[PDB]
Ligand binder design. Structure first.
Ligand SMILES: CCCCCCCCCCCCO[C@@H]1O[C@H](CO)[C@@H](O[C@H]2O[C@H](CO)[C@@H](O)[C@H](O)[C@H]2O)[C@H](O)[C@H]1O
Ligand SMILES: CCCCCCCCCCCCO[C@@H]1O[C@H](CO)[C@@H](O[C@H]2O[C@H](CO)[C@@H](O)[C@H](O)[C@H]2O)[C@H](O)[C@H]1O
Ligand SMILES: CCCCCCCCCCCCO[C@@H]1O[C@H](CO)[C@@H](O[C@H]2O[C@H](CO)[C@@H](O)[C@H](O)[C@H]2O)[C@H](O)[C@H]1O
Ligand SMILES: CCCCCCCCCCCCO[C@@H]1O[C@H](CO)[C@@H](O[C@H]2O[C@H](CO)[C@@H](O)[C@H](O)[C@H]2O)[C@H](O)[C@H]1O
Ligand SMILES: CCCCCCCCCCCCO[C@@H]1O[C@H](CO)[C@@H](O[C@H]2O[C@H](CO)[C@@H](O)[C@H](O)[C@H]2O)[C@H](O)[C@H]1O
Ligand SMILES: CCCCCCCCCCCCO[C@@H]1O[C@H](CO)[C@@H](O[C@H]2O[C@H](CO)[C@@H](O)[C@H](O)[C@H]2O)[C@H](O)[C@H]1O
Ligand SMILES: Cc1cc(C)c2cc(C(=O)NC3CCCCCC3)[nH]c2c1
Length: 725
C-alpha cells in the first residue's frame, strides 16, 4: 500500500504536484469568502429550556432591537445637549444615514428625537451635566448574522455623525469587533508566524529548499482547508471560530508532517539511496507515521460531536479537514516535490539568502542515563508538582461572551464601559419567566401576580426602584410580536451573575399557577443550560476519547501496560495545563503582562481544549515510545531501547515542538481572550510533553516497570500482528 504509492508518487510526480496544487489553490480562492458565510451561534444547546424560552418570547413579544446599537453623542466646544442648533444638525445627519440605508436601519430613537419629553426613561438618555446623550439605532434583519452584516454596512457613515464625536456600543459594534479579531490573528499566522517558522526550519535543516517545503505545505493545507470549510458552510452553519483553528491547529500539524518526511528523505539520501528509492522508503516509514498520526488526531476529535453546541461541531469539522488534507499533502505534493528535487533539496545554503557532535549525542545519552540511575529521584518530585498544578482547577468558573473578551484598552470595549457608567441601568441581563397557558385562554393579571409573588420568594434579584412591586416587570412588546394572550413574560436581572446556576434552579422549582407552564430563559439561562449539557456529556466524551486512543496505542505498541501508562501520562498533562490555565485566566496571574481581563472561562472551550491536548500528547507519546518498541522487538535491553528511542527521535520531536511553539505563540497575542486560552493551553502542554514527559517522566517510569512494559497477551498481540498498524 505505502510501497505502491511510494513508487506511484515518483512515477506521476509532475501530475501529482499539478493536480494537488491546483485543488488547494482553487480551494483557497473558494475559501476567501468563508468569513462572509460563518455564524456567531453555536455556544448554546438548541434543545434546552432557555432556548425554547427565547423562541417563545421573541415570537410573542417581538425581537428586541433596542440594544442593536447605542451611540453616545457629545456636543463640541463644551456645548450642552440642549443646544437647539446642535440638536438640529445631528438630527439631520442621523436622518440622512437612515434614509440612505433603509434596507439596513429601522430607525433611530432617543431623547434627541423628543427633547421636551416628560418620560423618565427617555429623559434618562441624557446625562445630568447635559454633556452627553445617547440614542438607540435598531437594525433590520431576521437573525443575528444578518443584523451584524447590516451594521457593518452602515458603520462607516454612522461613525462620521457629529464630526466623528460619536461612540458606538451595544451588541453589533462589539460583535463586529469580536469577530474582527479573526482577521487580525490570521494575518499574524501568515505574515509573522510563517516567516519565523522559516527561520526555525532553516536552523533545523541548514538549507533553504528543505526549510521552505514544510512552510509551503502548511500554506497549501490552510488554503484547501478553508475551502473545505466553505463547502461545509453550504450544508450546515459554521461558527466563525472554526476559521482561526484552521490556521493554528491545521498549520502547525501540516508543517510538522512536512518536517517529518523531509527529514526522513534527507536521511535516506544521506544513507546512499537514490531519489527513487528514497521517496519510496520515506513514504513507507514517515508516510505511515503521519497517516497514523492523522487517525490519532481524528480519533481524538470526533468525540466532541457528542456535544450539542454547534460551536464544537464546527471546530471538529475544521480539525478533521485540516489534518486529513495535511496528511494527504505531505505524501502527495511533498513527496513528488522531493522526487523532482532529489539531493538538490540541500542545494542552497546560507550564502543564497545572505546575498539575494559526539559531545551532543553523549550528553543527551548521558541525561537519559542519569535519569535511569536515580529514577525515583526524578519521577517522585515531578509526580507531586504536576498533581499540585491541578489544584487551581478547583476554582474553575464558567460564563459567556462579553466586551471583557477584548483587551481592557480596546476602544470598542471602552465605549461600552463608558456607556454603562454614563447611563446606568439601561443595560440588563434578565432571567425570564415565560408563562404559557396550555388552554389557549388569556393569562390573567392575577396569575401574573401569582408568578411574581413566587419569584419574589427567591433572593438575589436586582431591585432598582427599591419596590418589589416594580420587580419582575413584563417584557416590553414590539409590533413584530404576535401578542398571543396565552403567553406572558416577566423578567428580572440578578444581583450577582455567578449565582445564575443556583437561582435558575430555584426559579424552575417554583410552582406556577394552576394551568400555566413556565420556561426560564434569558442570557444567563442560555449559558447555564449549555454548561450543564456539556458537563453532562463530558463523562461519555472522555470515555470514548480514552478508549479509542488506548486501543490505537495498543495497535501501535503491542503492549497492555504501555497504552495504560501513556493514558495516565496524558491525564497528568491534561490536568496540569488546565490548572495552570485556570490559574492564569480565572485567577488572573499574568493578566497584566498579557493585557487580558481575568474572568470565567467559556465552557465549550474546555471540551475543545481537552480533545486537543489529549490528541497532542497521544501523538507525541506514540512516536517516541514506538521507536523504543521497535528497538526492543529486534533484540535489545530495556535500558538500551529507552536510550535508542530518545536519541533516534530527539531531533524530530524537538523541531516539531519548536515549530508548534512559534505557531501557537503567534496566537497568544490575539485580542480575543478565548484564543489566548487555547493558544496557551497548547504551549503549556507542548512544553510539558516535550521536556518534562519525554526526557524525564517517560524514561524514568519505564525503567521502574522494567521488561513488563512490553507485556501483552499473545492472543491480543496476534490481533495486532494480523493487522500491523
Ligand atoms: C450595552 C448597552 C446596550 C443596551 C442598552 C440599550 C437599551 C436602551 C435603549 C432604550 C430604548 C427604549 O427607550 C425609549 O423607550 C421609550 C418608551 O417606549 C420609546 O418611546 C419614545 O419614543 C419617542 C422618543 O424617540 C417619543 O415619542 C417619546 O419620548 C416616547 O414615546 C423611545 O423611543 C425609546 O428611546
Ligand atoms: C476537567 C475539567 C473539569 C474540572 C471540573 C472542575 C470542578 C471544580 C469543583 C469546584 C467545587 C464545586 O463543587 C461542585 O461539586 C459538584 C458535585 O459535588 C460538581 O458540580 C455540581 O454542582 C454544580 C454547581 O452548580 C451543579 O451544576 C450540579 O449540581 C453539579 O454539576 C462540581 O464538582 C462542582 O460544581
Ligand atoms: C479526559 C478526562 C477528562 C474527564 C473530565 C471529567 C470532569 C467531570 C467534572 C464534572 C463536574 C464539573 O461540574 C461542573 O462544575 C462547575 C464548577 O466548576 C459548575 O459550575 C458552576 O459553578 C461555577 C463556579 O461557581 C460558575 O462559575 C458556573 O457558571 C456554574 O455553572 C458546573 O455547573 C458543573 O457542571
Ligand atoms: C460574538 C457575539 C457576542 C457579542 C456579545 C457581546 C456582548 C455585548 C454586550 C451586550 C449588550 C446588549 O445588552 C442587552 O441589553 C438589553 C437591554 O437591557 C437586554 O435586553 C433585555 O431587556 C429588554 C428590555 O427590558 C427586553 O426587551 C429583552 O428581551 C431582554 O433581553 C439584552 O438581553 C442585552 O443583551
Ligand atoms: C375589582 C377590583 C378592581 C379591578 C382591578 C383593576 C386593577 C386594580 C389593581 C391596580 C393596581 C395593581 O397594582 C399593580 O398592577 C400592575 C398591573 O397589573 C402590576 O404590574 C405588573 O404586572 C403587569 C401585568 O399584570 C405587567 O404588565 C407590569 O409590567 C408589571 O409591573 C403591578 O405589579 C401591581 O403593583
Ligand atoms: C524554547 C521553548 C520552546 C517551547 C517548548 C519547546 C520544547 C522543546 C524542548 C526540547 C528540549 C531539548 O530536547 C532535546 O533536544 C535534543 C537536540 O535537539 C535531542 O537530541 C537529538 O539531537 C542531538 C543533536 O542535536 C543528537 O546528538 C541526539 O542524539 C538526538 O537525540 C534530545 O534527544 C532532546 O531531548
Ligand atoms: C490534537 C493535536 C493538535 C496539534 C496542534 C498537534 C500537533 C501534532 C504534531 O506535531 N504531531 C507530530 C508528532 C507525532 C508523530 C507524527 C509527526 C507529527 N499533533 C497534534 C495533535
Amino acid at each position: 500500500m505505502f510501497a505502491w504509492w511510494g513508487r506511484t508518487v515518483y512515477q506521476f510526480r509532475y501530475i501529482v504536484i499539478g493536480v494537488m496544487v491546483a485543488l488547494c489553490l482553487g480551494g483557497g480562492v473558494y475559501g476567501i469568502s468563508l468569513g462572509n458565510h460563518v455564524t456567531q451561534s453555536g455556544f448554546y444547546d438548541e434543545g434546552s429550556q432557555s432556548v425554547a424560552a427565547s423562541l417563545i418570547g421573541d415570537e410573542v413579544y417581538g425581537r428586541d432591537r433596542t440594544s442593536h446599537v447605542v451611540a453616545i453623542l457629545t456636543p463640541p466646544d463644551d456645548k450642552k445637549v440642549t443646544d437647539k442648533a446642535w440638536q438640529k444638525k445631528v438630527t439631520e445627519e442621523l436622518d440622512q444615514v437612515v434614509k440612505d440605508h433603509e434596507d439596513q436601519i429601522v430607525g433611530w430613537v432617543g431623547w434627541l428625537k423628543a427633547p421636551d419629553t416628560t418620560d423618565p426613561t427617555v429623559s434618562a438618555m441624557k446625562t445630568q451635566d447635559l454633556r452627553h446623550t445617547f440614542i438607540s439605532i435598531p437594525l433590520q434583519g431576521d437573525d443575528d448574522d444578518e443584523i451584524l452584516k447590516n451594521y457593518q454596512v452602515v458603520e462607516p457613515e454612522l461613525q462620521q455623525v457629529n464630526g466623528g464625536d460619536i461612540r458606538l456600543a451595544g451588541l453589533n459594534p462589539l460583535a463586529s469587533e469580536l469577530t474582527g479579531t479573526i482577521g487580525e490573528d490570521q494575518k499574524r499566522a501568515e505574515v509573522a508566524a510563517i516567516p519565523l517558522v522559516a527561520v526555525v526550519l532553516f536552523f533545523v535543516f541548514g538549507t533553504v529548499i528543505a526549510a521552505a517545503l514544510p512552510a509551503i505545505i502548511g500554506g497549501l493545507a490552510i488554503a484547501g482547508a478553508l475551502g473545505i470549510m466553505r463547502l461545509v458552510a453550504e450544508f450546515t452553519p459554521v461558527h466563525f471560530f472554526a476559521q482561526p483553528v484552521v490556521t493554528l491547529i491545521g498549520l502547525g500539524i501540516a508543517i510538522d508532517y512536512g518536517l517529518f518526511i523531509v527529514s526522513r528523505f534527507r536521511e535516506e539520501i544521506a544513507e546512499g539511496y537514490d531519489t527513487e528509492a528514497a521517496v519510496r522508503r520515506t513514504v513507507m516509514t514517515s508516510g505511515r507515521t503521519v497517516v497514523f498520526s492523522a487517525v490519532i488526531i481524528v480519533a481524538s476529535s470526533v468525540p466532541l460531536l457528542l456535544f450539542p453546541q454547534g460551536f464544537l461541531k464546527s471546530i471538529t469539522y475544521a480539525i478533521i479537514a485540516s489534518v486529513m488534507l495535511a496528511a494527504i499533502l505531505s505524501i502527495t505534493v511533498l513527496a513528488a516535490a522531493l522526487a523532482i528535487l532529489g539531493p538538490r533539496v540541500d542545494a542552497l545554503g546560507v550564502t543564497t539568502l545572505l546575498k539575494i557532535e559526539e559531545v551532543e549525542r553523549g550528553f543527551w545519552g548521558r541525561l537519559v542515563n542519569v535519569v535511569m540511575k536515580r529514577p525515583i529521584a526524578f519521577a517522585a518530585p515531578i509526580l507531586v508538582v504536576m498533581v499540585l498544578l491541578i489544584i487551581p482547577l478547583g476554582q474553575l468558573s464558567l460564563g459567556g461572551i462579553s466586551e471583557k473578551y477584548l483587551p481592557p484598552d480596546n476602544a470598542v470595549r471602552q465605549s461600552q464601559e463608558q456607556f454603562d457608567k454614563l447611563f446606568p441601568g439601561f443595560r440588563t441581563e434578565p432571567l425570564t419567566l415565560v408563562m404559557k397557558r396550555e388552554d389557549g385562554e388569556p393569562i390573567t393579571d392575577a396569575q401574573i401576580a401569582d408568578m411574581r409573588a413566587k419569584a419574589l420568594t427567591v433572593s438575589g434579584f436586582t431591585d432598582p426602584d427599591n419596590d418589589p412591586e416594580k420587580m419582575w416587570k413584563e417584557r416590553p412588546a414590539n409590533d413584530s410580536g404576535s401578542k398571543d394572550p396565552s403567553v406572558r413574560v416577566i423578567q428580572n436581572g440578578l444581583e450577582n451573575r455567578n449565582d445564575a446556576a443556583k437561582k435558575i434552579d430555584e426559579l424552575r422549582a417554583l410552582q406556577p399557577p394552576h394551568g400555566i407552564e413556565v420556561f426560564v430563559g434569558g442570557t444567563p439561562a442560555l449559558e447555564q443550560d449549555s454548561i450543564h449539557s456539556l458537563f453532562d456529556k463530558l463523562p461519555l466524551m472522555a470515555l470514548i476519547l480514552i478508549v479509542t486512543t488506548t486501543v490505537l496505542m495498543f495497535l501501535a505498541f503491542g503492549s497492555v501496560v504501555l497504552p495504560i501508562k501513556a493514558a495516565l501520562m496524558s491525564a497528568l498533562t491534561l490536568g496540569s495545563t488546565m490548572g495552570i490555565l485556570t490559574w492564569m485566566f480565572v485567577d488572573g496571574h499574568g493578566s497584566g503582562l498579557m493585557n487580558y481581563t481575568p474572568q470565567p472561562l467559556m465552557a465549550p472551550m474546555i471540551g475543545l481544549i481537552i480533545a486537543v491536548i489529549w490528541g497532542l500528547s497521544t501523538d507525541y507519546e506514540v512516536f517516541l515510545v514506538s521507536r523504543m518498541v521497535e528497538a526492543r522487538e529486534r533484540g535489545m535491553s530495556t535500558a538500551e531501547a529507552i536510550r535508542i528511542g530518545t536519541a533516534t527521535t530527539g531531533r524530530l520531536i524537538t523541531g516539531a515542538a519548536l515549530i508548534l511553539a512559534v505557531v501557537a505563540g503567534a496566537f497568544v497575542f490575539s485580542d480575543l481572550v478565548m484564543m489566548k486560552y487555547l493558544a496557551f493551553g497548547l504551549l503549556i502542554a507542548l512544553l510539558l510533553d516535550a521536556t518534562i514527559i519525554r526526557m524525564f517522566l517517560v524514561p524514568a517510569v519505564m525503567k521502574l516497570l522494567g521488561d513488563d512494559c512490553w507485556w501483552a497477551p499473545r492472543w491480543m498481540k496476534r490481533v495486532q500482528e494480523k493487522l500491523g498498524l
